[PDB]
Amino acid sequence: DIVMTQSPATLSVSPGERATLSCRASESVSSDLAWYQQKPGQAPRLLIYGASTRATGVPARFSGSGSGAEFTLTISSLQSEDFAVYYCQQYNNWPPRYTFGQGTRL
Amino acid sequence: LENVTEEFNMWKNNMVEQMHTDIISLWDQSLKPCVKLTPLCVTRLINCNTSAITQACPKVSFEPIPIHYCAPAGFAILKCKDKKFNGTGPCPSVSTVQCTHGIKPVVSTQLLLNGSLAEEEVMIRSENITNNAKNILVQFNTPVQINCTRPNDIRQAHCNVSKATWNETLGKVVKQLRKHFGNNTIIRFANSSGGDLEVTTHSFNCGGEFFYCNTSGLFNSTWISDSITLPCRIKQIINMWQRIGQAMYAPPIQGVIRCVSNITGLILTRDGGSTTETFRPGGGDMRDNWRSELYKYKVVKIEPLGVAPTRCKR
Amino acid sequence: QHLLKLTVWGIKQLQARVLAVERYLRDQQLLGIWGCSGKLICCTNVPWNSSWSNRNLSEIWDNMTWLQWDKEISNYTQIIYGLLEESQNQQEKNEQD
Amino acid sequence: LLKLTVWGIKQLQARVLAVERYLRDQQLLGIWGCSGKLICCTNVPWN
Amino acid sequence: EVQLVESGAEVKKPGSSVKVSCKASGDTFIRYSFTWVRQAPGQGLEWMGRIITILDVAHYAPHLQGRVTITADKSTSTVYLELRNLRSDDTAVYFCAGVYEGEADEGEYDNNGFLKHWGQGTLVTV
Amino acid sequence: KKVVLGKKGDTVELTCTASQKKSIQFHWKNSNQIKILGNQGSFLTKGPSKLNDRADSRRSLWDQGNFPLIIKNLKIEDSDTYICEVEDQKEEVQLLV
Ligand SMILES: *[C@@H]1O[C@H](CO)[C@@H](O)[C@H](O)[C@H]1NC(C)=O
């Protein structure tokens, strides 16, 4: 019965600018959130799991934070290869009813 | 009571079944597992199918409380008082009690945590010595204090037990086994032999978290005529002791989980082939975890109506 | 939680009290069928058999407990109960008419 | 319901208590050989 | 770490049954939990199903409940999707994916809901 | 006694039947009376014998009264008489290979 919409649907910043992508829920999903990026024509790649822990082989400029129904992913130095579509996925509930974000474009 | 003897038996007791059913009701109403796999398998024409009942599994606190069974009106429970009790046979000094003594319904394989002690000496009880298939129950006279906890890899827990007290307790145990086995035989202790993970290891519950502690460092001595640490590993795939079937649980609680306990009993099994004898720890059947404390109670029904011949009138 | 103290703790004790009262009344009724009404040590008119493990009265009344005496006539109690309840009290109250 | 828990169990306890008091007192009359009868005679003398 | 290989692209008429295979290689197969996820062309990601291997237990989304079966083969180490009664919404790209959870042989498990390892994608037209 | 034949490098299922349709205590012993596999309620346990790594049983059939014994990687040294002890009954099965 989970619904999933995030408010910054479309974003366009200059390269070299710190950007914030927000993740909104209808209730508290604790801290079980994953931040993904997807290049077009390719499979998605994981960036952040658990909403505050970095993964393996990821740049250090990505920083996720927040709690409840309030999450922000900030990126410090925008590069050329980060032109992709970003998603946040929650996995708080058992038995699993999971859903993705709608997908924001950088 | 007066000068009365009564034929006590504990291996055919009826209160053990009432204990067992009440405690299966307690665990089926208290601990809600995430995923259950119970083999249903309802029909050489057999067909086995497995159910997939899934429920929400939150975290709940869990510590045992004392429970006193009491007989209803018209029934009474008799309690034996012999200190050196064989377990079966005649008790020559029995009393009438209204409610039995305090029992903590603890789950424990390989050991008897938080139980009740003995009076004079360490006692050994069995259904049949020289049968090679019945669990030998050992009750201590002094409690071995064991500290057993997870320090702040989340699935790593140490478990300290004192060395000199355990050596003295095992010396008392081997001295008591030497009564039944000719007073000159070598006694050996092994770790386990195969089986599922909750029998080959000391498996119990602490703070709502399951513990699977190895016992290879405790049963390693051979007897002739400062602190042991045990590597407890918290597991999530378990086999239920209610019925046959697997269970899924949650990841453990972030923080520190601490519980101290008193080792009061033991479950051993002889390995008799074709000389020395090897006792290896066992368990797994929880009726053996309640026959060692309801060993001296018997429910009985009063029938206050008799007939007798006299020289009376009309 | 005053409502919880009068739904699980307040009904089981009442059920135990009603069970004890009803058990006492039905067993006293079983005494009352035999013609004893409400006496403790009652007397009746049934001849004691030379069977049913007959001994002299001194050994019965001075040597054996009540438990051994009930275990000795464990097999033969229903015949004695049928002799008390049936064909004696109905016969005696037939003779009264 | 609140009334079936509160009001009824007090009436039931009162009736059970009255019946049990009458039963105890009739048993005490039945000990002396005076079961059932309102008036009966015994064998002790009036000192 | 592992690598995942999907089957080729398939074109299905409506009302048929489409069968998608995903083979994983690089580690022991039962130490993973898998998930089938859909991506429509130009739209976002849609969660469909999650299978747990050591129990062989599959949970699904209520969007399309009763239409897919996700099975696992530990002998061939492959995860299988079967969609029957497919309609024109599922003209999309499917991804099989897996996630590690520790020593699932001995009993350790973690309830990991993130999706680390991914395939390459199978395109399907209805 | 019951006789069963087998081949080298094969899996053989020995059958033990009980009169009750309930999971009860059973044990398997060799001719030297050493445990092979048994139950302790819901958990299987294994004996100290030489067949410790090749012994298994179907856990789903214990409710049906059948307590089979499965031998994988069977060798010539396994051709003995196995005794199933259940509900005070001692059944004997002779394996030949
Ligand atoms: C005594 O008992 C025996 C056997 O129970 C019976 O045959 C006999 O008739 C009885 N005699 C009397 C007087 O009750």
Numbering used by the authors:
A (entry chain R): 1 to 95, 95A, 95B, 96 to 104
B (entry chain A): 86 to 128, 192 to 300, 325 to 397, 412 to 460, 464 to 503
C (entry chain D): 563 to 659
D (entry chain F): 565 to 611
E (entry chain S): 1 to 52, 52A, 53 to 82, 82A, 82B, 82C, 83 to 100, 100A, ...
F (entry chain N): 1 to 97
Quote the authors verbatim.
The HIV-1 envelope glycoprotein (Env), a homotrimer of gp120-gp41 heterodimers, mediates virus entry into host cells. The gp120 subunit engages host receptors, while the gp41 subunit contains a fusion peptide (FP) that inserts into the host membrane to effect host and virus membrane fusion. Prior to its binding to host receptors, the HIV-1 Env is characterized by a closed configuration with gp120 protomers packed against each other and the gp41 subunit, while the highly conserved and immunodominant coreceptor-binding region at the Env trimer apex remains occluded by packing of the first and second (V1V2) as well as the third (V3) variable loops. At the trimer base, FP comprises a hydrophobic stretch of 15–20 amino acids at the gp41 N terminus.
Population 1 dominated at all three time points and consisted of a partially open Env in which each of the three gp120-gp41 protomers were bound to CD4, 17b Fab and VRC34.01 Fab. We selected the Population 1 reconstruction from the 1.3-hr time-point for our analysis as it contained the largest number of particles and the highest resolution among the Population 1 structures from the three datasets. In Population 1, the gp120 subunits exhibited known structural markers of the CD4-induced conformation, including the bridging sheet at the 17b-binding interface and residues 63–73 assembled into the α0 helix. The gp41 subunit appeared conformationally less perturbed and was bound to VRC34.01 with a similar interaction interface dominated by the FP and the gp120 N88 glycan, as previously observed in the structure of VRC34.01 in complex with the closed BG505 SOSIP. Although no symmetry had been applied during the cryo-EM data processing, the three protomers were highly similar in the symmetrically open Population 1 intermediate. Since no symmetry was applied during the reconstruction of the Population 1 map, three distances were noted for each measure: 63 Å, 66 Å, and 66.9 Å for the interprotomer distances between residue Asp368, and 75 Å, 77.6 Å and 78.2 Å for the interprotomer distances between residue Pro124. Our Population 1 structure revealed a similar gp120 opening geometry as the cryo-ET structure of membrane-associated HIV-1ADA.CM Env bound to three membrane-associated CD4 molecules, suggesting that Population 1 represents a physiologically relevant entry intermediate. In summary, our vector analysis indicates that the partially open Population 1 intermediate described here shifts the gp120 domains away from the central axis, while the open and open-occluded structures shift the gp120 domains orthogonal to the trimer central axis. In the Population 1 structure (VRC34.01-bound), the FP was extended out of the Env core to bind the VRC34.01 antibody, whereas, in the 8ANC195-bound structures, the FP was buried in an intra-protomer gp120/gp41 hydrophobic pocket.
